[PDB]
């Protein structure tokens, strides 16, 4: 009698877990939706009778697996549950890190800022969730399309013996070598060098 | 087996556990707590076992804790409003812990944990695992997750 | 009869201060009906006592402490303090920075003197870097204890720069300390 939500997905980036869905075709009136999460006891409600096409599930434990379901409701009748399973540590997207770049003669100092988890704190970032975090840097001379890779040991690195007065663009991403999982790349930051070699 | 991630738990999870311990302490004072032949805390430290035996001791303490607090959330639904998210997490850790595992001090410890629910009152066990809750999470789990670095 | 009874934490340790020979005891939260005397502060003449690394202590719960004034003529009543949950109320100490310089990189590594009975606390520090008398300092990203902060150095000139750092302890909620005494040196 009532159509279920369509294309039910979990958009999770840096443990900001947004259950998105598309409203099905309905001609009687404006639909509403109710999303639930399976807590340890029973399906608890998160969004009740909202008019939005999304619900926030960032409050989930982010340890272990969670079961999420949503249905569409009109008046007293309601649709069937569309149920997905979400594992935050494995299904969340690792966002781009920050990158502060400084020019020093033929060298190029770049510091990497961790991707931040909104519902946590400065002392617990994406770098602290995964035990084998390592940054992954990629650079090239602007206009050459010849990428070079470097894996820094920590959150700082120096690119030495570069060409003088040449613009280089740099990117950084998270990476997990235990699973070979890569995070998203940072936006390319391009900076020009100066002169002389030490 | 990869429990090394549990050296540093997410602070929001610890805030959820802290609300649980504060909620359990309010219920334990009105119940008949403090029974004879106490088990927590254990007199010896986990560093006094071999690295491969430490998860075995931690598993038996965590399984008891999970078994007791699950029975506590089913006894008091109002108290289970706070215990729900902790229970989910303790279960997941226990699952990850059992993946690292195939008459000394470990035999007698595993024995007393196994012969305690059948010979102790519920409010006592509830109080016993409540005060041991952050001993398990902050010290014992940390030691086991640190592998050969805990010494 | 000691009046002010305060059980406070300063620099990773728990101390008990009292204001008017003294006797001091402590009670654990699970062992609510049991007190235990301090051997180090037994008959002491000071106004503070170290409540850290005790014989049967349990820093993983809250504990109170009581103190009474004694004399060869009379005994005063006990005056108990408030509870202090160590894992949630411990105050950290500013680190000691070990400064080394290589080429154009300055590494500022934090070091700690920690009590032996301390739980495995998660310590991170934030390094402050600035020229002597600048007003505007440079805060670097939160860095784990055991990893240095590497700082880009300009090779020219020889300006007097100072370095400071503060500890951030994070269990359930981050707890910040003050900044250390700024270590000033000759940049080059
Ligand atoms: C604690 O001592 C201070 C001065 O040292 C005093 O001002 C305060 O009233 C005292 N607190 C009491 C008596 O509760
Ligand atoms: C903190 O206390 C420890 C002993 O517990 C001591 O070694 C250290 O110097 C103290 N740090 C201070 C007072 O800044
Ligand atoms: C820095 O100090 C810490 C103290 O905990 C030590 O572990 C480490 O080896 C020192 N050196 C570096 C490069 O981190």
């Amino acid at each position: 009698m009532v159509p279920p939500p369509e294309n039910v997905r979990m958009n999770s980036v840096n443990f900001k877990n947004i259950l998105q869905w598309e409203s099905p075709a309905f001609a009687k009136g404006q639909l509403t939706f109710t999303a639930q999460y399976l807590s340890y006891r029973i399906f608890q409600d998160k969004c009740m009778q909202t008019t939005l096409t999304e619900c926030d599930f960032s409050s989930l434990s982010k340890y272990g697996d969670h079961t999420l379901r949503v249905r569409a409701e009109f008046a007293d009748e309601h649709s069937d549950w569309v149920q997905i399973t979400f594992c935050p540590v494995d299904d969340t997207i690792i966002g781009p890190p920050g990158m502060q770049v400084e020019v020093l003669a033929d060298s190029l100092h770049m510091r990497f800022l961790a991707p931040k988890i909104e519902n946590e704190y400065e002392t617990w970032t994406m770098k602290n969730v995964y035990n084998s975090w390592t940054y992954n840097v990629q650079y090239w001379k602007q206009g050459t399309d010849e990428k070079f890779q470097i894996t820094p040991q920590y959150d700082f690195e120096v690119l030495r013996n570069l060409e003088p007065w040449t613009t280089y663009c740099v990117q950084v991403r998270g990476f997990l070598p235990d699973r070979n999982k890569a995070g998203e790349w940072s936006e390319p930051v391009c900076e020009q060098t100066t002169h002389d070699e030490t | 087996c990869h429990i090394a991630q549990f050296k540093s738990l997410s602070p929001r999870e610890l805030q959820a556990f802290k609300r649980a311990k504060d909620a359990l302490e309010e219920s334990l004072l009105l119940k008949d707590c403090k029974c004879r032949s106490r088990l927590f805390p254990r007199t010896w430290d986990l560093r006094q076992l071999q690295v491969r035996e430490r998860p075995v001791a931690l598993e038996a303490e965590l399984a008891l804790t999970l078994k007791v607090l699950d029975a506590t959330a089913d006894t008091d639904p109002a108290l289970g409003d706070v215990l729900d998210q902790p229970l989910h997490t303790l279960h997941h850790i226990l699952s990850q812990l059992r993946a690292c595992i195939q008459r000394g001090r470990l035999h007698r410890w595993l024995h007393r944990l196994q012969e305690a629910p059948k010979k102790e009152s519920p409010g006592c066990l509830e109080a016993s695992v409540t005060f041991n809750l952050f001993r398990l999470l902050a010290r014992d789990l940390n030691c086991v997750a640190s592998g050969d670095l805990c010494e | 009869p000691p009046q002010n009874v305060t059980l406070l934490s300063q620099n990773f340790s728990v101390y008990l201060t009292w204001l008017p020979t003294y006797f001091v005891a402590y009670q654990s939260s699970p062992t609510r009906r049991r007190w235990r005397e301090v051997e180090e502060c037994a008959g002491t003449k000071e106004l503070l006592c170290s409540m850290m690394c005790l014989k049967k202590q349990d820093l993983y719960n809250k504990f109170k402490g009581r103190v009474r004034t004694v004399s060869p003529s009379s005994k005063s009543p006990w005056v108990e303090s408030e509870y202090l949950d160590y894992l949630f109320e411990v105050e950290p100490a500013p680190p000691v920075l070990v400064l080394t310089q290589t080429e154009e990189i300055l590494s500022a590594n934090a070091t700690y003197q920690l009590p032996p009975c301390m739980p495995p606390l998660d310590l991170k520090y934030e390094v402050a870097f600035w020229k002597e008398g600048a007003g505007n300092k440079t805060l670097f990203p939160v860095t784990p204890h055991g990893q240095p902060v590497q700082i880009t150095l300009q090779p020219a000139a020889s300006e007097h720069h100072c370095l400071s750092a503060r500890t951030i302890y994070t269990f359930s909620v981050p707890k910040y300390s003050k900044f250390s005494k700024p270590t000033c040196f000759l940049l080059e």
Side-chain angles (χ1 to χ4, degrees), chain A residues 1-5 7-21 23-40 42-76 78-115 117-194 196 198, chain B residues 1-27 29-30 32-33 35 37 39-102 104-107 109-117 121-151, chain C residues 1-2 4-26 28-31 35-38 41-44 46-55 57-63 65-81 83-102 104-112 114-130 133-136 138-177 179-180 182-188:
Chain A
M1 179 161 55
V2 183
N7 193 14
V8 183
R9 59 193 175 275
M10 163 59 54
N11 192 346
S12 182
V13 185
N14 300 326
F15 296 105
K16 175 159 147 288
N17 318 322
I18 309 295
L19 182 72
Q20 290 175 354
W21 63 87
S23 184
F26 194 67
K28 296 181 179 179
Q30 176 197 31
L31 286 174
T32 54
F33 311 93
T34 290
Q36 296 186 321
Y37 71 101
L38 184 56
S39 43
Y40 190 71
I42 194 179
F43 278 102
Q44 188 172 351
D45 304 88
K46 204 68 173 188
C47 296
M48 297 192 68
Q49 281 77 18
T50 69
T51 59
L52 297 177
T53 76
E54 64 196 23
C55 191
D56 200 335
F57 279 96
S58 303
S59 303
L60 293 177
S61 152
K62 90 183 63 174
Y63 290 103
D65 307 274
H66 298 272
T67 302
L68 313 165
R69 64 180 190 185
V70 60
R71 71 180 179 192
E73 307 179 341
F74 185 70
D76 293 330
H78 44 62
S79 65
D80 305 325
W81 292 110
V82 186
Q83 181 177 106
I84 72 173
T85 57
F86 176 49
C87 181
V89 279
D90 291 331
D91 298 338
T92 201
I93 297 179
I94 303 176
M99 180 169 44
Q100 297 171 1
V101 173
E102 185 177 359
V103 178
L104 194 153
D106 59 316
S107 59
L108 202 140
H109 302 236
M110 41 207 189
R111 182 179 310 284
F112 322 112
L113 322 174
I117 304 177
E118 201 176 86
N119 58 29
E120 298 288 6
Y121 303 83
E122 299 181 354
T123 47
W124 213 81
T125 61
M126 292 296 293
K127 189 218 296 181
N128 310 94
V129 184
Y130 305 101
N131 199 250
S132 78
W133 183 279
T134 178
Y135 291 99
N136 204 334
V137 183
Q138 193 188 215
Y139 67 103
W140 63 92
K141 174 177 178 175
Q142 191 184 33
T144 58
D145 309 333
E146 191 180 65
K147 267 83 173 187
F148 298 88
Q149 310 293 336
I150 36 172
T151 296
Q153 187 179 9
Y154 297 106
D155 46 28
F156 191 89
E157 191 58 41
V158 285
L159 270 180
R160 305 192 174 185
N161 289 83
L162 294 177
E163 297 301 323
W165 301 111
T166 299
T167 297
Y168 289 85
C169 303
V170 292
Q171 282 183 304
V172 65
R173 73 185 175 180
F175 189 87
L176 317 181
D178 54 341
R179 336 164 178 187
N180 287 326
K181 178 179 184 186
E184 295 178 342
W185 284 116
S186 65
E187 291 287 323
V189 168
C190 311
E191 285 286 327
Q192 182 177 356
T193 57
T194 61
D196 201 31
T198 62
Chain B
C1 167
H2 51 284
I3 54 176
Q5 47 168 355
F6 297 150
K7 290 183 57 180
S8 176
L9 299 177
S10 85
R12 293 298 179 178
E13 204 63 89
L14 295 172
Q15 295 169 11
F17 280 113
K18 177 52 171 184
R19 285 185 240 105
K21 182 183 176 190
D22 295 345
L24 293 169
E25 286 181 352
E26 302 179 26
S27 180
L29 264 58
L30 282 72
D32 49 316
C33 58
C35 64
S37 66
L39 53 100
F40 290 146
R42 59 174 192 276
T43 56
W44 51 278
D45 195 80
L46 225 51
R47 310 165 96 99
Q48 306 175 17
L49 288 189
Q50 295 169 327
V51 285
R52 295 186 180 273
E53 288 181 354
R54 296 170 190 170
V56 181
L58 182 59
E59 183 278 336
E61 303 174 12
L62 184 56
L64 191 70
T65 310
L66 194 63
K67 189 185 185 66
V68 168
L69 296 184
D70 199 318
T72 303
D74 306 11
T75 300
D76 187 351
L79 202 42
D81 177 64
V82 164
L83 293 171
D84 173 278
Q85 179 177 0
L87 265 287
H88 161 88
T89 301
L90 290 186
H91 178 90
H92 171 248
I93 297 176
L94 180 53
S95 180
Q96 287 283 359
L97 205 59
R98 300 189 188 189
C100 301
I101 308 180
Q102 290 66 272
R105 68 162 58 98
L106 180 55
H107 172 72
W109 178 234
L110 299 176
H111 179 257
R112 194 155 81 261
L113 296 176
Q114 189 242 346
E115 300 287 332
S121 52
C124 182
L125 291 183
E126 292 172 355
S128 183
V129 314
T130 293
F131 302 139
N132 189 79
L133 190 57
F134 286 108
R135 285 194 288 255
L136 187 153
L137 291 178
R139 172 173 61 92
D140 296 330
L141 180 57
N142 194 275
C143 181
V144 172
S146 300
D148 294 10
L149 307 169
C150 181
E151 190 56 46
Chain C
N4 288 61
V5 50
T6 304
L7 197 272
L8 49 85
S9 182
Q10 170 184 6
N11 163 46
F12 297 117
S13 180
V14 178
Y15 299 91
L16 182 71
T17 49
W18 56 87
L19 274 303
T21 57
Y22 297 90
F23 274 163
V24 287
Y26 78 104
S28 193
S29 185
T31 83
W35 290 88
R36 204 158 276 118
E37 297 63 21
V38 167
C41 317
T44 171
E46 288 288 339
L47 68 308
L48 65 92
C49 179
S50 181
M51 305 292 292
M52 198 59 172
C53 306
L54 301 198
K55 164 172 208 63
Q57 207 179 22
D58 178 30
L59 291 177
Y60 300 100
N61 284 274
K62 57 181 186 300
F63 64 95
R66 61 180 193 183
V67 48
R68 65 171 175 189
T69 297
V70 290
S71 69
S73 59
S74 174
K75 280 176 169 295
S76 67
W78 288 108
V79 190
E80 53 178 4
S81 68
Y83 283 110
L84 173 134
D85 207 326
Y86 181 83
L87 280 182
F88 299 96
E89 306 183 37
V90 59
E91 294 178 354
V96 180
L97 289 175
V98 174
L99 311 182
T100 56
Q101 180 186 356
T102 290
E104 66 285 337
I105 297 300
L106 172 64
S107 63
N109 192 37
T111 55
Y112 290 93
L114 305 173
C117 66
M118 198 195 70
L121 306 192
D122 177 79
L123 304 192
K124 302 185 168 69
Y125 61 113
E126 188 177 6
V127 164
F129 177 65
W130 70 103
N136 290 94
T138 295
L139 290 180
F140 293 97
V142 177
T143 294
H145 172 214
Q147 170 203 321
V149 184
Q150 306 193 93
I151 307 172
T152 297
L153 282 186
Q154 261 56 36
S158 60
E159 184 61 31
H160 297 68
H161 291 78
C162 306
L163 269 166
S164 188
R166 65 167 185 184
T167 303
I168 318 170
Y169 159 63
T170 303
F171 184 62
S172 59
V173 174
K175 185 60 182 299
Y176 298 77
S177 76
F179 283 83
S180 61
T183 301
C184 309
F185 50 87
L186 202 60
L187 170 142
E188 235 184 5

